[PDB]
Design a protein around this ligand. Sequence first.
Ligand SMILES: C[N+](C)(C)CCO
Length: 255
Amino acid sequence: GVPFGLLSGIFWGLGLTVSAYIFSIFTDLSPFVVAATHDFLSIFILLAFLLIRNVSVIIGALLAGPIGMQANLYAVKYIGSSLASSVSAIYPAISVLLAFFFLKHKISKNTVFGIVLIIGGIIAQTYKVYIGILCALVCAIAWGSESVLSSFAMESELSEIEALLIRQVTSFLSYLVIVGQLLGLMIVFAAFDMISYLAYYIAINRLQPAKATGLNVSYVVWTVLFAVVFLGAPLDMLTIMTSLVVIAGVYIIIK
Ligand SMILES: C[N+](C)(C)CCO
């Protein structure tokens, strides 16, 4: 069960760097259409896996799709290959802050304490860098509410056919109301995002969000590994330290 969330970290961490690889080749020539086609291509490779409490899903999906994911997409233009991932990784603190007050109290002396060290090893480097940090704070508020609102239903509603299916078509319908090689990189980015968000939901089913979201912020270390090997990040001395505090806290939350 625990690996399912650890798999959610690496796969979104590699995918959120190939999205930076997409923008790095034209420098945000198209801000918004990337996210609209993102869910458009996502529905088809999500349905490729094939071969009412719906309100609680849609009210958290519009709280993290129209304002959470695409803000991580367009509102994070070039501030960093992972510099948005760091401060958007305080979202478990916003999620645990909401989860503890909505009939979910299962934390220990070294379960949220590992989340605390994971945030303090990031906030210290947060200012080692306006619009980018704004939405990166917004992505933290949005995904943290979605994690509890996704865990809200989570009964007679499977992680795929109701959890991630309604979550995808809701944001895809939202952009419909708000409105070659790139399609290969887009469908490649869609292929990595959809195994990730399902694996995050499979970790949300059996494992509590306080630990499932806490193992997810491993997506901050893999998003620097992919961003320094596939992309050649400068990796100053402060990067290895923040990479260590976020994994040193991962081994406190996992145990
Ligand atoms: C994929 N998100 C990072 C948006 C959710 C955590 O898995």
